[PDB]
């Protein structure tokens, strides 16, 4: 076979240890999910880090810096995102993994919801990728391995992520990934039906209005790996309708510099037929983790953050924002009347 005896036994034992880890992780998640913190004037607002908004803030008492997500309650209602916003908070407060951003505080006022997270100062993967053009395959593989482990963790908890893209992956001071933006994350045992995500990253079954499952995240991983290694995603067009048509055809073309191992992995992730898509088969995540393209990946060493990162962002101080682009600053206005109190009682 492909593995000799010693290798097969080591791999089997490793896979059983993963099961043991995940069983303990589920116990811990459920305890927090069942038995789950500040106010605005506790923070100085420094600078906007991203919009869609997230601000760098400094906690007055401790001087610690954080990234504070601010959501307008009225906008959340009008856009039908109430449940999604409750999902984001509940999931973030209950999960624990080295590549998932940590939520430190949450609160609300008359106008807004607030989620205060660890500040990840290295910037978005998106910026670095657009600046350099493309990542070499080893560099892309280092990031991809972190996403594979993160999805193995989330999916074991019956959590679907639903918004993988370089814009949502932050680089920390050691060069490792922090996944942010859990607004579409959801506890899903089997199928779910909401049409949501980002066009270039949507699996065909989402676009086709089918009940879909966690395999949409594995499709999105294929899009991410392609984009990291090529510099642009596999289904690329100026308008969403054109993007959707390319996705549903499923025809993928690869740059001539992609290795055959990479193309094979991507054909198995960017697989329209769910009976054939890696991550959706009997062998589960192991079809991905044991693929030839990942043969050099030490999964435990990645988890332990002991692999030397390909890139370490420059950091000049705890509140430095040099790795982030600039955005228009809008003052945070808080109405004298409570808005949408009933809708957000559980937040």
């Amino acid at each position: 076979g492909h593995m000799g005896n010693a290798a097969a036994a080591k791999k089997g034992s490793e896979q059983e240890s993963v099961k043991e880890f995940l069983a303990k992780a589920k116990e811990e998640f459920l305890k927090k999910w069942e038995s789950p913190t500040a106010q605005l004037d506790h923070f100085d607002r420094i600078k906007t880090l991203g919009t869609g908004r997230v601000m760098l803030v400094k906690h007055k008492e401790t001087g610690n810096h954080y990234a504070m997500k601010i959501l307008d309650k009225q906008k959340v209602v009008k856009l039908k995102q109430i449940e999604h916003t409750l999902n984001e908070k509940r999931i973030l407060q209950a999960v624990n993994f080295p590549f998932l951003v940590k939520l430190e505080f949450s609160f609300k006022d008359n106008s807004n919801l607030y989620m205060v997270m660890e500040y990840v100062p290295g910037g978005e993967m998106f910026s670095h990728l657009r600046r350099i053009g493309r990542f070499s395959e080893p560099h892309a593989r280092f990031y991809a391995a972190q996403i594979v482990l993160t999805f193995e963790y989330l999916h074991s908890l019956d959590l679907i992520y639903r918004d993988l893209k370089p814009e949502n992956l932050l680089i920390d001071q050691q060069g490792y990934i922090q996944v942010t933006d859990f607004g579409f994350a959801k506890r899903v045992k089997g199928r779910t039906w909401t049409l949501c995500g980002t066009p270039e990253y949507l699996a065909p079954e989402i676009i086709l209005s089918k009940g879909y499952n966690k395999a949409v995240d594995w499709w999105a991983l294929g899009v991410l790996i392609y984009e990291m290694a090529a510099g642009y995603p596999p289904f690329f067009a100026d308008q969403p309708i054109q993007i959707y048509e390319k996705i549903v055809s499923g025809k993928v073309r690869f740059p001539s510099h992609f290795s055959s191992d990479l193309k094979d992995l991507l054909r198995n992730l960017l697989q329209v037929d769910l009976t054939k898509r890696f991550g959706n088969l009997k062998n589960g995540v192991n079809d991905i983790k044991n693929h030839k393209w990942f043969a050099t990946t030490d999964w435990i060493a990645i988890y332990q953050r002991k692999v030397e990162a390909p890139f370490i962002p420059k950091f000049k101080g705890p509140g430095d924002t040099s790795n982030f682009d600039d955005y228009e600053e809008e003052e945070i206005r808080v109405s004298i009347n409570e808005k949408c109190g009933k809708e957000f009682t559980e937040f």
Binding site: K165, L195, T198, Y232, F236
Partner: peptide
């Protein structure tokens, strides 16, 4: 030709 800037999520198609 395609989108090179930051891509926003969609809530419905």
């Amino acid at each position: 030709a395609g989108r090179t800037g930051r891509r926003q999520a969609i809530h419905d198609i």
